[PDB]
């Protein structure tokens, strides 16, 4: 685990609802460079299941269209870590959140993509600061940020 900032005392029930992918960063440029890059995903809403698992609704650009996609991140013994059903099991870590404004997460395989999630389609400076802090610690090579207009569009167009 490259990332070892996780949220202590996370209540996954309290992250339900709508989120905006305000900023994203990754360890390798090609993880995010193209609109159809594998890990360029835009989070729509988080749905924590009754048994503490986490279902994610997101949009992803795929073969010349902005696709709707659903993902279930299964819980682990660590509250801030979940595992996804990809070819390789790869983890989602929740680094920090105040539930009502921002959530920082990363997902990892060697590879790593992190996002600053926000509740509203606005530029939350403090959240972006918290994101930048969590990140200096990590080997990121691409960083993207979106304005309020792009945040209201499918696939941040």
Ligand X SMILES: CCCCCCCCCCCC[N+](C)(C)C
Contacts with its own copies, residue ranges (CB under 8 A): 29, 33-35, 140-147
Q: Where does this chain touch ligand X (CB under 6 A) — which range of 1-9, 38-46, 121-129, 143-151?
A: 38-46
Chain CA centroid to CA 157, Å: 18
Q: Specify the residue, 65 or 149, whose C-beta has the smaller distance to ligand X.
A: 65
Total residues found in the chain within this entry: 157
Is residue 3 a contact residue for ligand X (CB under 6 A)?
no
Q: Specify the residue, 90 or 150, whose C-beta has the smaller distance to ligand X.
A: 90
N-to-C CA span, the chain: 33
Cα–Cα distance for residue pair 23/32, rounded to 1 Å: 11
Is residue 10 a contact residue for ligand X (CB under 6 A)?
no
Is residue 56 a contact residue for ligand X (CB under 6 A)?
yes
Helical spans, DSSP H, in the chain: 125-136, 148-151
Q: Specify the residue, 26 or 41, whose C-beta has the smaller distance to ligand X.
A: 41
Cα–Cα distance for residue pair 97/74, rounded to 1 Å: 19
Residue nearest ligand X, CB atom distance: 105
- Helix, strand or coil, per DSSP, at residue 41: coil
Footprint of ligand X on this chain (CB under 6 A)? 38, 41, 43, 56, 71, 73, 86, 92, 94, 103, 105, 107
């Amino acid at each position: 685990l490259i990332v070892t900032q996780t949220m202590k005392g996370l209540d996954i029930q309290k992250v339900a609802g709508t989120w905006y992918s305000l900023a994203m960063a990754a360890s390798d440029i090609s993880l995010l460079d193209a609109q159809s890059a594998p890990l360029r995903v835009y989070v729509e809403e988080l749905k924590p299941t009754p048994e503490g698992d986490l279902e994610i609704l997101l949009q992803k650009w795929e073969n010349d269209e902005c696709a709707q996609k659903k993902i279930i991140a299964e819980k682990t013994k660590i509250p801030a870590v979940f595992k996804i059903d990809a070819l390789n099991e790869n983890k989602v870590l929740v680094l920090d959140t105040d539930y009502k404004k921002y959530l920082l997460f990363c997902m990892e395989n060697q590879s790593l993509v992190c996002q600053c999630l926000v509740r509203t389609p606005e530029v939350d400076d403090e959240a972006l600061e918290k994101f930048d802090k969590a990140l200096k610690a990590l080997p990121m090579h691409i960083r993207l940020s979106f304005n309020p207009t792009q945040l209201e569009e499918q696939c941040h167009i």
